[PDB]
Design a protein around this ligand. Structure first.
Ligand SMILES: CCC(=O)Nc1cccc(N)c1C
Ligand SMILES: CCC(=O)Nc1cccc(N)c1C
Length: 166
């Protein structure tokens, strides 16, 4: 039961034009087994396009690589991002939390995806009653990228709808 390959890929932007399949692989093999590693090049000149992708054997390895950012590859800090499900944001909408979900429920759950900077539990402008949804802002986009590819989110017993926000 191998995780889908799309969820094991990291797109690496900002490459040095000197980076090769081999040097990209040598770098990212520090955090797991790479089943694929390619630097994108022009079909005619073979000059690097400045980006490429690596595929790990497992999702846990993708996490390890993301948690080892910043990555300086061949002298240049690169920009790894998980493959598209790129709309790169740090904020999520959390819906379906009803009136009884509080800040600590959302924090205790989502803090295991990344570092939380803001939790905004939405209330009615007129009555102050909870509206049943919230926004969570993290310090970095990978948290959000991990969150929105999950099929399910269970918080405070509620089955929640979670999507990228703005
Ligand atoms: C940093 C060196 C570099 O850009 N390499 C390069 C330049 C022009 C053509 C081709 N094919 C290649 C590999
Ligand atoms: C496996 C990924 C993981 O545990 N989550 C993570 C990664 C990086 C920063 C922070 N704060 C957190 C909670």
């Amino acid at each position: 039961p191998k995780e889908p390959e799309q969820l094991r890929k990291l797109f690496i932007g900002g490459l040095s034009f000197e980076t090769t399949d081999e040097s990209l692989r040598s770098h990212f093999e520090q955090w797991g087994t790479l089943t694929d590693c390619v630097v994108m090049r022009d079909p005619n000149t073979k000059r690097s396009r400045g980006f490429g992708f690596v595929t790990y054997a497992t999702v846990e390895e993708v996490d390890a690589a993301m948690n080892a950012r910043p990555h300086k590859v061949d002298g240049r800090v690169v920009e790894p991002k998980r493959a598209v499900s790129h709309l790169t944001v740090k904020k999520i909408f959390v819906g379906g939390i009803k009136e009884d979900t509080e800040e600590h429920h959302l924090r205790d759950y989502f803090e295991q995806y990344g570092k939380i900077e803001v939790i905004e539990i939405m209330t009615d402008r007129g009555s102050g009653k909870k509206r049943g949804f919230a926004f969570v802002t993290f310090d970095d986009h990978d948290s959000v990228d991990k969150i929105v590819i999950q099929k399910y989110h269970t918080v405070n017993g509620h089955n929640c709808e979670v999507r990228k926000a703005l």
